[PDB]
Structure formats: structure tokens, C-alpha cells
Amino acid sequence: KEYDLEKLVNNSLDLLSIQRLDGTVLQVNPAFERLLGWREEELIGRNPFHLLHPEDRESTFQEFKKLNQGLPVFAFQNRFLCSDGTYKYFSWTASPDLSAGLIYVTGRDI
Amino acid sequence: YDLEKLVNNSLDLLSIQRLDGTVLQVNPAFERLLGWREEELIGRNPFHLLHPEDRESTFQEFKKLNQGLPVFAFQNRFLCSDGTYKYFSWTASPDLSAGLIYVTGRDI
């Protein structure tokens, strides 16, 4: 089963990610490399808020508080730094799992 | 599993089909975007919901999948439960050995 689901997630053009409640990235699909230019290994195991545009920090952290309170987030927009040194806009939809301590993230470039 | 929770909580359409088109698995996003319940899609070919003008192009893509070639950001219209056609962008990866196609979709 886990093989099939892996092929499903990895063949999405949209960003699919699993984070911890504190922000630590556990999983990313190849779409991140395609859209942001960063390799998987450079993102996994670390918090991504350092690629977050300074102006978008306050709003993004407020959304992360909501996730930590067990509220979903729909079509939230912020900017992430890409490997070419430019900021690109993304629309995020995030679903929290408090028992597992995870957040399930879907992202679209805009 | 964790990946299952990712698939089932995703805004994107995620589906597994057979090479002949028969739908084996569908995530809740299909119900959300197309209005159809899982039970009424599983086990069935979805080309019925395919807009007539998009049939020829979609079947050409399915031939490519059957030749083992992936398909990226292919756009067609599917009929929804409210009786309207909605636009989708599909990305499909074939697995000839398993006899499956991994389909990922986004509403346009």
C-alpha cells in the first residue's frame, strides 16, 4: 500500500508536505524542488520559516497557532524564498492532527 | 498510515485507476470537488463524466499511459453532481507491472 501512496503523492504538481506542530518538515514531494528549487534533503528535518518572507512571518505564525489549536487553514497566502533568490507566492491549505502531532499541507503556486 | 492521512486530507484529487480506466481508489477531494460519493465512482470507468469535446484528447492521453508514458497538467472537463462541467488539470503516472495509473488532479 505504502508504495502506491508514495507514487501518488510524488506525482502531484502541487506541494504536499507533512510538518510537525512546531513546524519541522518531515516530508515533501518533488514539487517543492520544482517550484522552490531546493532539494528535499535541504528542507527535511528543519523548520522552513527561514525561507519565509519577513513581512509574512506574523501572519503565518498566527495560522500556525490556529493549527496548534486544532483548526484547519484554507487558502492562506505567503511568500517563500526560492533557490534563485526570489520570493514566490503560495496558497496553503493545512489540516492538523493533534493526536499524531502532525500537520498535513497542500500548496499551490499563484 | 501517515501517507494515507496526507492523501485523504489533501485539497488535490488523488486516485488509483487500472490501465483500462476502472477507478480503484479515490480520496475525499473527489466528493468535495465533483460532488460524487466514493461508492458511486469506485469500480467504474469515469469516461462517462467526461465532456464529449474532451473525449478524443483524453483517450489519446490514456493510450500514452498504456504505452508507459506519464502525462502532465492535462486539462479536461468532468461532469459534477449538480449537472455542470468543471475544468481539471490532471497528472498521471503509469505502472505497467502493477497495471495501475496514479492520478493527481487540481481544479482550474
DSSP chain B: -HHHHHHHT-SSEEEEEETTS-EEEE-THHHHHH---GGGTTTS-STTSB-GGGHHHHHHHHHHHHTT--EEEEEEEEE-TTS-EEEEEEEEEEETTTTEEEEEEEE-
CB B76 within 8 A of CB B61: no
- A77 contacts chain B (CB < 8 A): no
Instruction: Give Cβ neighbours of residue A10 (< 8 Å, ≥ 6 apart).
Output: A29, A30
- Give the domain CATH number at B48: 3.30.450.20
- In DSSP terms, A108 is beta-bridged to A91
A47/B contact by beta carbon, under 8 A = no
- CA triplet B48, B54, B55: central angle to 5 degrees? 50
Name beta bridge partners: B103.
Answer: B15, B92
Q: CA A110 to CA A108: how far, in whole Å?
A: 6
- Assess contact for A71 and A62: CB atoms under 8 A: no
Rounded to whole angstroms, the Cα distance separating A80 from A33 reads 13
Q: Tell me, what amino acid is at B27?
A: N
Which residues have CB under 8 Å from B44's CB, separation 6+? B22, B23
Residue B60: half-sphere exposure toward Cβ, Cα within 13 Å: 8
In B, which residues are within 8 Å of A5 by CB distance? 1, 3-4, 6-7
CA dist., res. B66 & res. A10, Å (int): 20
Cell matching residue A86: 526570489
Kindly report the three-state secondary structure assignment for every residue of chain A: CHHHHHHHHHCCCCEEEEEECCCCEEEECCHHHHHHCCCHHHCCCCCCCCCECHHHHHHHHHHHHHHHCCCCEEEEEEEEECCCCCEEEEEEEEEEECCCCEEEEEEEEC
Domain of residue B21 covers 2-107
Closest C-alpha among A48, A102, A38, B26 to residue A29: A38
What is the experimental resolution, given in Å to one decimal place? 2.5
Cross-chain residue pair A4–B72, CB shorter than 8 Å: no
End-to-end alpha carbon distance in chain A: 32
Answer whether B72's CB lies under 8 Å from B101's CB. no
Alpha-carbon distances of A3 from A10, A42, A87, rounded to whole Å:
11, 23, 34
Distance CA A76, CA B11 (A): 13
Number of domains in chain A: 1
Nearest CB to B73 within list A13, A97, A100: A13
- Residues present in chain A in total: 110
As beta bridge partners, residue A106 has A16, A93
At position B30, the amino acid (one-letter code) is F
**Is B7's CB within 8 Å of A8's CB?**
yes
Contact of A99 with chain B, judged by CB distance below 8 Å, is answered with: no
Largest CA distance in chain B: 39
How, if at all, do strands B100-107 and B13-18 pair?
Answer: antiparallel
CB contact under 8 A, A97 and B5: yes
Pairwise CB contact (< 8 Å): A8 & B102: yes
